[PDB]
């Protein structure tokens with residue numbers, strides 16, 4: 001388990017969404033290194049225009065988070081490998097619509113694949129999301145994780161910067177069960193959103209650093 005993340009690991013991400021009737025598909029490819037809690041990914045939409053800002057999808061696209069070598073006992077994500085785990089989430093955007101997510105994170109050879117499906121409902125156009133009024137960036141957050149004794153689950157809020165100056169919050173409720181146990185801790189997350197030099201498609205370059213505490 002902890003064996004597989006001792007070096008450089010390539011990543012593959014697939015996501016499928018449906019927000020108020022608007023469908024789309026995002027393909028993600030790159031590389032991650034759990035030793036320093038670093039992953040560099042590039043996401044490409046094949047349906048063209050997104051009906052939803054990239055920052056909101058960031059949390060929906062953790063086995064590469066750096067756990068201190070005395071807190072390896074709290075790393076559930078690496079213990080489930082290479083069998084994998086399921087990642088269920090229901091993101092509650094403040095004063096707007098919500099997300100529903102179930103992901104499949106497992107090893108398919110030499111790469112780690114993340115199969116995701118998303119559902120968006122009750123979103124208001126004229127809001128921060130459908131109007132695309134959120135800043136193309138990501139703040140620092142704390143992912144409080146509790147243990148799921150009879151087999152984990154996490155809780156955290158995301159602060160999306162609005163172009164006007166306000167902040168769009170989003171409560172995240174997470175549940176993880178292994179496909180094939182820690183005390184209450186949390187993770188410190190840092191993420192950078194960017195674009196690439198020669199890429200005329202709607203995309204998102206992602207560099208993220210996460211460390212346990």
Ligand SMILES: [Cu+2]
Nearest residue numbers: 018117118119
């Ligand atoms: Cu669907």
